[PDB]
Amino acid sequence: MKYLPQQDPQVFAAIEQERKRQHAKIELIASENFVSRAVMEAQGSVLTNKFAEGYPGRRYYGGCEYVDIVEELARERAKQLFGAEHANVQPHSGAQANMAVYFTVLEHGDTVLGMNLSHGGHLTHGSPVNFSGVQYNFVAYGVDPETHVIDYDDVREKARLHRPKLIVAAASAYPRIIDFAKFREIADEVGAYLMVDMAHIAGLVAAGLHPNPVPYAHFVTTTTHKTLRGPRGGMILCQEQFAKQIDKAIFPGIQGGPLMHVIAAKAVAFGEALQDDFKAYAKRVVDNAKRLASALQNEGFTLVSGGTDNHLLLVDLRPQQLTGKTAEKVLDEVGITVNKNTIPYDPESPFVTSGIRIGTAAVTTRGFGLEEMDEIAAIIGLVLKNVGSEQALEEARQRVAALTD
Amino acid sequence: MKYLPQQDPQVFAAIEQERKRQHAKIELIASENFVSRAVMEAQGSVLTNKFAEGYPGRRYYGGCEYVDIVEELARERAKQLFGAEHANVQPHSGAQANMAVYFTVLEHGDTVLGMNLSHGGHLTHGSPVNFSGVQYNFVAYGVDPETHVIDYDDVREKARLHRPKLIVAAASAYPRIIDFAKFREIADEVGAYLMVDMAHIAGLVAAGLHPNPVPYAHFVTTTTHKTLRGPRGGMILCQEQFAKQIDKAIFPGIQGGPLMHVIAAKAVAFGEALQDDFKAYAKRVVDNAKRLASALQNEGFTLVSGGTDNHLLLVDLRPQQLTGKTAEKVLDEVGITVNKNTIPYDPESPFVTSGIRIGTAAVTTRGFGLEEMDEIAAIIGLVLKNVGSEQALEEARQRVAALTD
C-alpha cells in the first residue's frame, strides 16, 4: 500500500494488525479462505467509480462498455464452471442471492421447506429473526438422530404434509454429500421449485468433488467466497427459462447499482477456479478434511455423522463434557480459530452448543497438507483434554506458531 | 497493479479501458464521483478474508479484534460527521440501508408516503417493480407544477388522508433544499416515523451546505458513494433509542456477513470528509452547479425549478423539442456523460423522458471550476442546438478533449 498509510494511519494500523493476524493464526472457520492478490487488486480498482444499474448491453446509464465486458466475463466463466444456462453475478452477498430467489417465486406468507437450522441449515433458510422466517412460512426437515445424514423420508413427509411452494437444500454445517436428485424427486412429487444454496461447497462443485446441483435445481444460489475462494459476494445460477425473472428480482427488485469492482474480482476468481491447479487445490481440501477427521477420531473425538465427505467436520464434544463455547474460547487462547456450532439434537442453546465446526479450505490455501492435519488434530487433543493446564496451553501455542512459521 | 495483469489479461484489459474512459469523458451523472487512492487501497485489502457477522465487541465469530477497530472507526467518524447518536455502517448498498429501515418499523402491507418517482423520488421509495412497492403500500406526494418545489401542503394532505406509518423524504433528482423540519412536523401530526434518504446530498450535509436531516428524522439512510465521495455501500444513522432494532434489522434481519474491506474504505472516506479540504471541495461542487445552471440558462435552456440549491440540475428539453433519450445519446457521441431523467409532469415515459439530469460532483473532484462550467454549458448548447450537424459534433468532441486534457 502506498496512499493509505499516509492518508489514514489509524485504518492502516488496524489493517496491518489484521494481515499479521491472518498469518499468525490457524484458521479453521469452515467458510473462511484467502483470496489471491489478483482478486484483491480487482476489488481495489477504479471500477468502484462506475454506476451500472441494469445488465450488460441493457444498462440504464451510459459509459458501461467496459464494465459490460467485465460482467460478461464473470457470467460466462460462471456458466463454464458450473454448466448453468444463466448466471447473475450482481448479488451483494449470499443472503441477497437467496432473498432474490425468494422474491422471484414466492409471495408473502408462502410455505417453504428448508433444512433444520440446528441440524446445519442457514439463517436465510427460515430463521424467525431473519427476513426469510418473517416473510415466509418456513418448515424444516431433519437429519437422522444416529447417522446425522439428512432423512430423505422426512424431507418427503414434510413436503407432502405442508405442500411448500419451494424446497431449499444445502447447508452451513453439513459434513456429507447432499443428494440433489432425491431433493428434485421430492420437489417434483409435490410440485415445488427446488433451490440449492451451495455457498459452502461451491469450490468443491467446481472441481467435480461434490455432485453439481445445477442439473437438478431450478435455482442455485452461492457465495463467491468460501470454498470457491473468491471475493465476498453472491451469485445465482438458473436455466434460461427463469433468467429474465431472476435478473429482474436482483434489479429493480431487491438491489440498485452492482459493485462492479467486486464483479471484476468475481471474474478473476472464476478464472482461477477454471485452472487445473484449482482442481488439485480442491482435492487437497477434501483429502485434508478426511485426514483431519481421521486424526481427530484417533485423538478420541466423536464426529457428527462419523466423518466427512467435504471440506468440513463437526466435533460432538459431549463425550468430553465440554460445550462448543468453552472449546472455541480455549482454542482462541492458543491461536486456533474455530466456531462453536450446534450439533443435531443439541441439548444446548445455539449460543452455547455441544460442538465446534472445523473446515480445511483456508489452511489448504496456505499449503498445509496431511502431516499438518495430524499436528492440528494433536494440538486440538492436547488443548481440549487439558483445558485447565496453562503449561499445556503454552505448548499448544508454541506448536501452533511452529505450523504458521 | 502487479498481479492482475499476469493472472487475468482479459479482466485487466477491460479495467484499463475503464480507467482511461473515466479520464477521457466528462462525467455529469449526478451520483458519480472519483474516490481517492487510499479508499481504493482499503477496498483492495486482506479484510475481504474476514467473516465478521455481528457487531464490534459482539461478533458471532472469533478473531475480529482488528476489524472491530476498523468498524468502530467508521461508526465514530460517521457520528462526528453527521452528529448522529448511532451509525450502522454494514449496509451493502443504499437499497439495503432502506430495506433495513423498512424492515425495522413496518409490517407487510403497511402504508408509506414517499416522493413521487417521476418528480424525483427513488426506486426504493415505492416503485411497483421494487421490493418497496411490492412489500408495502406506497402513496406519493408531488412537487408544484410551476415551481417544481415539493408541495408541503400536498405532503400534509397525503399524510392525513392515507395515514402512513412512515414518511420518506429525499430524492435522486431534486435540485432544491428539502425542508426536513416541515417533514417532521407533518410526521408528528399524523404519528408517522420520518425516514430521510440523503444518498445524493450526504457530502453536502457533511460540509454544512445542506440542512442536516439527523436532528429531524428518526432514521437517516445514505450511500457512502455519491457526494460523500466514498466506496460503494450504504449506511444508517439514528438516535440511540432505535440503535438495537436497526442493528438487528441489518443482522440477522436482512444481511449476513459485512464487507469489512468496504467498511475500511468507508472509514477512510469519512476521515477525508472530516478534513477542511473536503468542506472546500463540497462548496466548489455547489458553486459549480449554480454556475453551470446559470450558464445553461444563458444558452437558452430551461431548468426544472429554475436552478439549483445543490450538486444537481435538471434540464427541461421541451422548449427544444428534444427528448432526454435523444439528448443523452448525442451527448454520449461527443464524450459528455449525462442521463435522461423524467421531469415533473413529464408527458413522456421514464424510458424516453423530457429531461437530462446533470451533477457537478465528479468534475469538481477532477479540479474543474467556474470557467469549465461555462465551457461545459457552451458545449451542451452547441450539441443540443445542432443535433444533425456532424461538424458541430466534431467541434464539441474536440472541446471536450480540451477540457479532459
Short mmCIF file of C-alpha atoms in Angstrom, two decimals, chain B residues 12-392:
data_model
loop_
_atom_site.label_atom_id
_atom_site.label_comp_id
_atom_site.label_asym_id
_atom_site.label_seq_id
_atom_site.Cartn_x
_atom_site.Cartn_y
_atom_site.Cartn_z
CA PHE B 12 -7.06 -6.29 -16.69
CA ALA B 13 -7.53 -5.04 -20.28
CA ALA B 14 -11.17 -4.18 -19.51
CA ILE B 15 -10.29 -2.43 -16.22
CA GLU B 16 -7.65 -0.39 -18.06
CA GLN B 17 -10.18 0.61 -20.76
CA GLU B 18 -12.48 1.76 -17.94
CA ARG B 19 -9.75 3.74 -16.18
CA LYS B 20 -8.88 5.50 -19.47
CA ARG B 21 -12.61 6.12 -20.15
CA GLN B 22 -13.00 7.73 -16.71
CA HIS B 23 -10.21 10.17 -17.62
CA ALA B 24 -11.33 10.91 -21.19
CA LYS B 25 -15.05 11.63 -20.63
CA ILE B 26 -16.86 14.49 -18.89
CA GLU B 27 -18.80 12.72 -16.15
CA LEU B 28 -22.00 14.58 -15.39
CA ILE B 29 -24.12 11.73 -13.94
CA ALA B 30 -25.19 13.33 -10.66
CA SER B 31 -24.48 10.28 -8.43
CA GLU B 32 -20.98 9.70 -9.82
CA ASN B 33 -17.65 10.68 -8.26
CA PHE B 34 -13.97 9.62 -8.10
CA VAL B 35 -12.68 8.06 -4.88
CA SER B 36 -9.16 8.56 -3.56
CA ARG B 37 -6.35 6.05 -3.95
CA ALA B 38 -6.48 5.47 -0.15
CA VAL B 39 -10.16 4.45 -0.41
CA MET B 40 -9.33 2.02 -3.22
CA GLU B 41 -6.41 0.50 -1.28
CA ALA B 42 -8.68 -0.11 1.71
CA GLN B 43 -11.15 -1.91 -0.61
CA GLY B 44 -8.30 -3.93 -2.11
CA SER B 45 -7.11 -5.08 1.35
CA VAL B 46 -6.92 -8.52 3.04
CA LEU B 47 -10.04 -7.54 5.04
CA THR B 48 -12.06 -9.34 2.33
CA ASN B 49 -10.80 -12.55 4.04
CA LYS B 50 -12.57 -11.90 7.39
CA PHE B 51 -16.00 -13.23 8.35
CA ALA B 52 -17.41 -10.79 10.94
CA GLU B 53 -21.15 -11.47 11.41
CA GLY B 54 -22.39 -9.40 14.33
CA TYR B 55 -21.07 -6.08 15.61
CA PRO B 56 -17.88 -4.71 17.23
CA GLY B 57 -17.30 -6.49 20.57
CA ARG B 58 -20.44 -8.55 19.91
CA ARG B 59 -19.36 -10.77 17.00
CA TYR B 60 -20.50 -14.31 16.38
CA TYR B 61 -17.02 -15.41 15.25
CA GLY B 62 -13.57 -15.08 16.82
CA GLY B 63 -10.53 -13.11 15.64
CA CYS B 64 -12.40 -9.85 14.97
CA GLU B 65 -10.28 -7.67 17.30
CA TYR B 66 -8.84 -5.62 14.42
CA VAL B 67 -11.83 -5.46 12.07
CA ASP B 68 -13.72 -4.24 15.20
CA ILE B 69 -11.32 -1.30 15.40
CA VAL B 70 -11.97 -0.61 11.69
CA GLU B 71 -15.76 -0.78 12.02
CA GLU B 72 -15.69 1.41 15.13
CA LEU B 73 -13.56 3.98 13.31
CA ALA B 74 -16.23 4.03 10.57
CA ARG B 75 -19.08 4.39 13.11
CA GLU B 76 -17.42 7.07 15.26
CA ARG B 77 -16.30 9.16 12.28
CA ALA B 78 -19.83 8.91 10.81
CA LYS B 79 -21.23 10.13 14.15
CA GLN B 80 -18.75 13.05 14.14
CA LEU B 81 -19.57 13.97 10.54
CA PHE B 82 -23.35 13.90 10.96
CA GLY B 83 -23.94 14.39 14.70
CA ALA B 84 -25.97 11.18 14.87
CA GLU B 85 -26.29 9.15 18.07
CA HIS B 86 -25.82 5.82 16.28
CA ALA B 87 -24.42 4.60 12.96
CA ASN B 88 -24.70 1.28 11.21
CA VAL B 89 -22.00 1.05 8.54
CA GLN B 90 -22.77 -2.52 7.42
CA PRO B 91 -25.43 -2.00 4.68
CA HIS B 92 -24.11 -3.39 1.37
CA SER B 93 -25.87 -0.58 -0.52
CA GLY B 94 -28.29 2.35 -0.22
CA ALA B 95 -31.09 -0.07 -1.21
CA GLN B 96 -30.17 -2.41 1.66
CA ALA B 97 -29.99 0.52 4.11
CA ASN B 98 -33.56 1.50 3.09
CA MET B 99 -34.69 -2.14 3.13
CA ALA B 100 -33.39 -2.47 6.73
CA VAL B 101 -35.22 0.66 7.94
CA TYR B 102 -38.46 -0.58 6.35
CA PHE B 103 -37.90 -4.00 7.98
CA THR B 104 -37.45 -2.28 11.37
CA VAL B 105 -40.65 -0.25 11.55
CA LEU B 106 -43.07 -1.70 9.02
CA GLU B 107 -45.16 -4.81 8.61
CA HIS B 108 -46.03 -6.22 5.19
CA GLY B 109 -48.74 -4.06 3.61
CA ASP B 110 -48.22 -1.00 5.82
CA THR B 111 -48.80 2.37 4.17
CA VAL B 112 -45.76 4.54 3.42
CA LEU B 113 -45.67 8.03 1.92
CA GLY B 114 -42.74 8.86 -0.37
CA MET B 115 -41.82 11.38 -3.07
CA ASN B 116 -43.39 10.79 -6.48
CA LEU B 117 -40.85 8.75 -8.51
CA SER B 118 -41.35 10.86 -11.63
CA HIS B 119 -40.92 14.06 -9.54
CA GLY B 120 -37.52 12.94 -8.17
CA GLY B 121 -38.17 10.06 -5.75
CA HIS B 122 -36.06 6.89 -5.75
CA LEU B 123 -36.88 3.35 -6.93
CA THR B 124 -36.74 2.12 -3.32
CA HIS B 125 -39.29 4.77 -2.28
CA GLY B 126 -42.21 2.71 -3.67
CA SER B 127 -41.69 1.57 -7.27
CA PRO B 128 -44.18 -1.25 -8.09
CA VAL B 129 -41.31 -3.27 -9.60
CA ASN B 130 -39.16 -2.75 -6.47
CA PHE B 131 -39.44 -4.66 -3.19
CA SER B 132 -40.61 -1.36 -1.61
CA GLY B 133 -43.78 -1.04 -3.74
CA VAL B 134 -44.45 -4.79 -3.67
CA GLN B 135 -43.99 -5.26 0.11
CA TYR B 136 -45.61 -2.04 1.35
CA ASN B 137 -48.46 0.21 0.31
CA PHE B 138 -46.76 3.31 -1.12
CA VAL B 139 -48.54 6.61 -1.71
CA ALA B 140 -46.82 9.67 -3.20
CA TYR B 141 -46.51 13.43 -2.71
CA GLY B 142 -45.62 15.78 -5.56
CA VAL B 143 -43.84 18.99 -6.46
CA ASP B 144 -45.70 22.13 -7.57
CA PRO B 145 -46.37 22.10 -11.37
CA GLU B 146 -44.88 25.60 -11.83
CA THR B 147 -42.09 25.93 -9.26
CA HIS B 148 -41.15 22.20 -9.10
CA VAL B 149 -40.59 22.60 -5.34
CA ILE B 150 -42.10 19.93 -3.07
CA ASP B 151 -45.67 20.91 -2.21
CA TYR B 152 -45.65 20.63 1.59
CA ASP B 153 -49.42 21.04 1.70
CA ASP B 154 -49.63 18.02 -0.61
CA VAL B 155 -47.26 16.09 1.71
CA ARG B 156 -49.56 17.01 4.62
CA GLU B 157 -52.80 16.17 2.79
CA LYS B 158 -51.49 12.79 1.62
CA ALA B 159 -50.22 12.09 5.16
CA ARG B 160 -53.62 12.96 6.68
CA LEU B 161 -55.68 11.04 4.10
CA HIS B 162 -53.63 7.84 3.91
CA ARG B 163 -52.26 7.74 7.50
CA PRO B 164 -48.85 6.30 6.61
CA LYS B 165 -46.83 4.53 9.30
CA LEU B 166 -43.69 6.01 7.75
CA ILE B 167 -42.98 9.11 5.67
CA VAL B 168 -39.89 9.11 3.42
CA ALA B 169 -38.15 12.33 2.38
CA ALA B 170 -35.25 12.75 -0.06
CA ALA B 171 -34.65 12.22 -3.72
CA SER B 172 -32.48 11.14 -6.65
CA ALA B 173 -33.39 14.11 -8.89
CA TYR B 174 -34.47 17.08 -6.77
CA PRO B 175 -32.36 20.27 -7.28
CA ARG B 176 -33.61 22.22 -4.24
CA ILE B 177 -33.07 22.10 -0.48
CA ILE B 178 -35.53 19.78 1.27
CA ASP B 179 -37.27 21.14 4.37
CA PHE B 180 -36.79 18.37 6.96
CA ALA B 181 -38.42 20.43 9.75
CA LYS B 182 -41.65 20.54 7.74
CA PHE B 183 -41.43 16.80 7.05
CA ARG B 184 -41.04 16.12 10.78
CA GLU B 185 -43.96 18.47 11.60
CA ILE B 186 -46.23 16.56 9.20
CA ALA B 187 -44.95 13.19 10.54
CA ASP B 188 -45.68 14.33 14.11
CA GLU B 189 -49.19 15.47 13.13
CA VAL B 190 -50.14 12.01 11.79
CA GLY B 191 -47.96 9.95 14.20
CA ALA B 192 -45.65 8.60 11.48
CA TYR B 193 -41.93 7.87 11.65
CA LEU B 194 -39.78 10.08 9.40
CA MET B 195 -37.04 8.49 7.29
CA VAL B 196 -34.72 10.69 5.24
CA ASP B 197 -32.79 9.09 2.39
CA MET B 198 -29.92 11.58 1.96
CA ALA B 199 -27.86 9.47 -0.52
CA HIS B 200 -27.46 12.26 -3.10
CA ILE B 201 -26.74 15.08 -0.67
CA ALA B 202 -24.76 13.34 2.10
CA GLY B 203 -21.45 15.08 1.16
CA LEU B 204 -23.19 18.47 1.14
CA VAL B 205 -24.76 17.71 4.54
CA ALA B 206 -21.29 16.74 5.90
CA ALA B 207 -19.91 20.08 4.66
CA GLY B 208 -22.79 22.17 6.13
CA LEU B 209 -24.10 23.15 2.69
CA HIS B 210 -27.47 21.40 3.03
CA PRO B 211 -29.54 21.28 6.23
CA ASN B 212 -28.85 18.12 8.22
CA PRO B 213 -31.85 15.71 8.49
CA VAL B 214 -30.35 13.92 11.53
CA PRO B 215 -32.00 16.19 14.19
CA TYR B 216 -35.38 15.84 12.39
CA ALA B 217 -35.52 12.22 11.22
CA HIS B 218 -36.00 9.04 13.25
CA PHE B 219 -33.89 7.27 10.60
CA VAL B 220 -31.48 8.65 8.04
CA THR B 221 -30.23 6.40 5.26
CA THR B 222 -27.46 7.12 2.78
CA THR B 223 -24.99 5.77 0.30
CA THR B 224 -21.32 6.19 1.17
CA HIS B 225 -20.64 6.93 -2.51
CA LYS B 226 -22.05 9.97 -4.45
CA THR B 227 -21.39 13.47 -3.00
CA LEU B 228 -19.82 11.89 0.15
CA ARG B 229 -17.19 10.50 -2.29
CA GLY B 230 -16.73 7.14 -0.57
CA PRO B 231 -16.74 3.48 -1.65
CA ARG B 232 -19.99 1.95 -2.93
CA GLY B 233 -22.19 0.97 0.01
CA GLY B 234 -24.87 2.01 2.47
CA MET B 235 -25.21 3.44 5.98
CA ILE B 236 -27.98 4.12 8.50
CA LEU B 237 -27.98 6.86 11.15
CA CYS B 238 -30.48 7.04 14.03
CA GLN B 239 -30.91 8.05 17.67
CA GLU B 240 -29.81 5.66 20.40
CA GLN B 241 -33.45 4.60 21.01
CA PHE B 242 -33.60 2.74 17.63
CA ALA B 243 -29.98 1.50 17.57
CA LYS B 244 -30.60 -2.05 18.78
CA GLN B 245 -33.56 -2.53 16.43
CA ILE B 246 -31.70 -1.04 13.43
CA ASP B 247 -28.63 -3.22 14.09
CA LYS B 248 -30.84 -6.35 14.34
CA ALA B 249 -32.60 -5.33 11.10
CA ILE B 250 -29.24 -5.38 9.26
CA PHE B 251 -28.09 -8.57 11.01
CA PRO B 252 -29.64 -11.15 11.40
CA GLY B 253 -32.55 -9.39 9.64
CA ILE B 254 -31.58 -8.70 6.04
CA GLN B 255 -27.84 -9.38 5.59
CA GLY B 256 -25.23 -11.91 6.69
CA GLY B 257 -21.53 -11.10 6.91
CA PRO B 258 -20.48 -7.44 6.34
CA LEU B 259 -17.89 -6.39 3.70
CA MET B 260 -15.09 -5.44 6.13
CA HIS B 261 -12.77 -4.18 3.39
CA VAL B 262 -15.53 -1.87 2.12
CA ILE B 263 -16.14 -0.78 5.74
CA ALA B 264 -12.43 0.08 5.98
CA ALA B 265 -12.95 2.16 2.80
CA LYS B 266 -15.97 3.80 4.44
CA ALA B 267 -13.79 4.79 7.45
CA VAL B 268 -11.22 6.25 5.04
CA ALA B 269 -13.87 8.28 3.17
CA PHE B 270 -15.36 9.58 6.45
CA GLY B 271 -11.82 10.58 7.53
CA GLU B 272 -11.44 12.55 4.30
CA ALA B 273 -14.85 14.21 4.73
CA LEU B 274 -13.87 15.40 8.23
CA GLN B 275 -10.98 17.42 6.73
CA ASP B 276 -11.23 21.13 5.90
CA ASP B 277 -10.33 20.47 2.27
CA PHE B 278 -13.48 18.34 1.85
CA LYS B 279 -15.58 21.32 3.01
CA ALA B 280 -13.87 23.48 0.38
CA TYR B 281 -14.49 20.73 -2.21
CA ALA B 282 -18.21 20.49 -1.37
CA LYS B 283 -18.60 24.28 -1.66
CA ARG B 284 -16.98 24.16 -5.10
CA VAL B 285 -19.47 21.40 -6.02
CA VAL B 286 -22.41 23.67 -5.15
CA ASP B 287 -20.78 26.81 -6.64
CA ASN B 288 -20.08 24.83 -9.83
CA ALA B 289 -23.67 23.58 -10.06
CA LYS B 290 -25.03 27.13 -9.68
CA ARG B 291 -22.58 28.41 -12.28
CA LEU B 292 -23.42 25.56 -14.65
CA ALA B 293 -27.14 26.21 -14.12
CA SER B 294 -26.67 29.95 -14.88
CA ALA B 295 -24.53 29.18 -17.94
CA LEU B 296 -27.10 26.68 -19.27
CA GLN B 297 -29.85 29.31 -18.88
CA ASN B 298 -27.55 31.72 -20.74
CA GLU B 299 -27.52 29.15 -23.60
CA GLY B 300 -31.32 29.23 -23.64
CA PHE B 301 -32.10 26.09 -21.62
CA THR B 302 -34.99 25.85 -19.17
CA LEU B 303 -34.14 24.25 -15.82
CA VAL B 304 -36.56 22.35 -13.58
CA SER B 305 -37.30 24.59 -10.53
CA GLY B 306 -35.42 27.41 -12.36
CA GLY B 307 -31.98 26.45 -10.99
CA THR B 308 -30.35 24.55 -8.14
CA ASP B 309 -29.54 24.71 -4.41
CA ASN B 310 -27.33 21.60 -4.52
CA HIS B 311 -24.99 19.48 -6.70
CA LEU B 312 -27.52 18.75 -9.44
CA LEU B 313 -29.77 20.29 -12.04
CA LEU B 314 -32.44 19.03 -14.45
CA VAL B 315 -32.81 20.42 -17.97
CA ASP B 316 -36.40 20.53 -19.28
CA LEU B 317 -35.81 19.93 -23.00
CA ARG B 318 -39.41 20.56 -24.14
CA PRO B 319 -38.59 24.09 -25.49
CA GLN B 320 -36.00 22.46 -27.80
CA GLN B 321 -38.50 19.73 -28.80
CA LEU B 322 -35.99 17.07 -27.69
CA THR B 323 -36.44 14.01 -25.53
CA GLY B 324 -34.00 13.17 -22.73
CA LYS B 325 -33.19 9.96 -24.61
CA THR B 326 -32.18 11.91 -27.75
CA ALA B 327 -30.06 14.37 -25.69
CA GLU B 328 -28.36 11.59 -23.70
CA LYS B 329 -27.47 9.74 -26.95
CA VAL B 330 -25.97 12.70 -28.81
CA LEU B 331 -24.02 13.92 -25.76
CA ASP B 332 -22.60 10.38 -25.46
CA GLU B 333 -21.35 10.80 -29.07
CA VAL B 334 -19.14 13.76 -28.02
CA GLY B 335 -17.90 12.33 -24.68
CA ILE B 336 -20.30 14.00 -22.23
CA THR B 337 -21.98 11.56 -19.85
CA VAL B 338 -25.46 12.50 -18.65
CA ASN B 339 -28.66 10.60 -18.02
CA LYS B 340 -32.13 11.06 -19.39
CA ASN B 341 -34.44 11.85 -16.49
CA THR B 342 -38.16 12.36 -16.11
CA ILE B 343 -39.10 15.93 -15.28
CA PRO B 344 -42.13 16.68 -13.02
CA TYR B 345 -45.40 16.15 -15.00
CA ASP B 346 -43.36 14.68 -17.87
CA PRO B 347 -45.58 13.86 -20.89
CA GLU B 348 -43.05 11.13 -21.86
CA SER B 349 -42.37 7.69 -20.40
CA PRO B 350 -39.42 7.16 -17.96
CA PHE B 351 -37.72 5.30 -20.83
CA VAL B 352 -37.91 8.37 -23.09
CA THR B 353 -38.34 11.41 -20.79
CA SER B 354 -38.30 15.17 -21.44
CA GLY B 355 -35.12 15.90 -19.43
CA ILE B 356 -31.48 15.27 -18.67
CA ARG B 357 -30.04 15.24 -15.15
CA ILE B 358 -26.60 16.78 -14.58
CA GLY B 359 -24.43 16.93 -11.45
CA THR B 360 -21.05 18.54 -10.74
CA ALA B 361 -19.56 16.29 -8.00
CA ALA B 362 -17.35 14.24 -10.35
CA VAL B 363 -15.94 17.10 -12.47
CA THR B 364 -15.31 19.12 -9.29
CA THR B 365 -13.26 16.23 -7.89
CA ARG B 366 -11.15 16.40 -11.09
CA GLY B 367 -10.46 20.09 -10.38
CA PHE B 368 -12.97 21.73 -12.75
CA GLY B 369 -14.10 25.22 -11.73
CA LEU B 370 -16.33 28.09 -12.90
CA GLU B 371 -14.63 28.58 -16.30
CA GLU B 372 -15.04 24.88 -17.02
CA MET B 373 -18.71 25.13 -16.07
CA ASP B 374 -19.15 27.92 -18.66
CA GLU B 375 -17.42 25.77 -21.30
CA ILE B 376 -19.45 22.64 -20.45
CA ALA B 377 -22.67 24.72 -20.82
CA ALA B 378 -21.40 26.13 -24.16
CA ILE B 379 -20.58 22.63 -25.47
CA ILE B 380 -24.00 21.33 -24.41
CA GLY B 381 -25.65 24.29 -26.21
CA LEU B 382 -23.55 23.62 -29.34
CA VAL B 383 -24.57 19.94 -29.37
CA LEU B 384 -28.27 20.18 -28.50
CA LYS B 385 -28.87 23.10 -30.88
CA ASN B 386 -27.17 21.21 -33.74
CA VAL B 387 -28.05 17.51 -33.30
CA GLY B 388 -27.92 16.94 -37.09
CA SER B 389 -24.54 18.55 -37.74
CA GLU B 390 -21.56 16.16 -37.70
CA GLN B 391 -19.26 19.20 -37.94
CA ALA B 392 -20.79 20.66 -34.75
#
